[PDB]
Amino acid sequence: HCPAACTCSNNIVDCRGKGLTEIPTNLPETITEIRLEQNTIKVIPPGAFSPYKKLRRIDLSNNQISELAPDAFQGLRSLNSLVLYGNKITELPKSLFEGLFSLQLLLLNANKINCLRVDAFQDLHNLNLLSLYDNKLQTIAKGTFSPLRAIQTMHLAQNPFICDCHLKWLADYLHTNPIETSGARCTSPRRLANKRIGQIKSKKFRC
């Protein structure tokens, strides 16, 4: 029930840096933490973690993940952290984070994410730390942050933000809630390129 390359004890499955090419299957149903970071997993298959509804922490960071089934984390109502940084993720399928009502940490930094659905974080009521650092986001649609009622910290930088009239809400949001702490900058238009989104008056975000 414990993969031969990993060490499992105290409900933790630890397969950190053991050459894994896929998520191991038939683990104990009681598992509360799964450590799969620093392997070469490429695919998160349909309802991958759905058998383990007692999961509180998943670490999938520093793999080669380019594909996530939309029900990869379905039913994980007790999940507190989802750590996905350092993969090749390009889009978040609809409902990927559906029903993760206990999630507190979501790390999506160092991926290739080029857009976010306005409902991407619809169920993340209790999230405290989100990172989208070092992705390919040009914009975030007004409303994407509305469901984040417990948010305390965001890492948004190293994204090519176009600071036009469609990102103006984010200027206002951050003036009100100065919780962006990685020094997010505009990259376009040229008039605002390389300036911190928090240092720019909203009135300057125009189309």
Domains of the chain: 1-207 (3.80.10.10)
Tokens 């996530």 locate to 68
d(CA 68, CA 94): 11
- Residue indicated by tokens 């994407």: 144
7 phi/psi in degrees, rounded to 5: -120, 125
CA-closest candidate to residue 181, choices 163, 197, 205? 197
Tokens of 14: 């630890």
Taking CA 50 as the corner, what is the angle to CA 70 and CA 126, rounded to the nearest 5 degrees? Answer: 75
Q: How many CB atoms lie within 10 A of CB 178?
A: 9
The kind and range of the H/E element at 99 are: none
Please give the method by which this entry was determined: X-ray
d(CA 147, CA 101) in angstroms, rounded, equals 11
Integer CA distances (angstroms), 160 to 5, 77, 173, 187, in order: 40, 33, 19, 5
φ, ψ (nearest 5 deg) of residue 85:
-70, 155
Give the number of other Cβ atoms within 10 Å of residue 95's Cβ. Answer: 17
Give the number of other CB atoms < 10 A from CB of residue 154: 22
Indicate the helix (H) or strand (E) that contains 14: strand 12-14
- SS3 assignment, position 92: coil
Q: First and final CA of the chain: distance in angstroms?
A: 57
Q: In this structure, are strands 12-14 and 7-9 parallel, antiparallel, or unpaired?
A: antiparallel
How many H helices and E strands in the chain? Answer: 1, 12
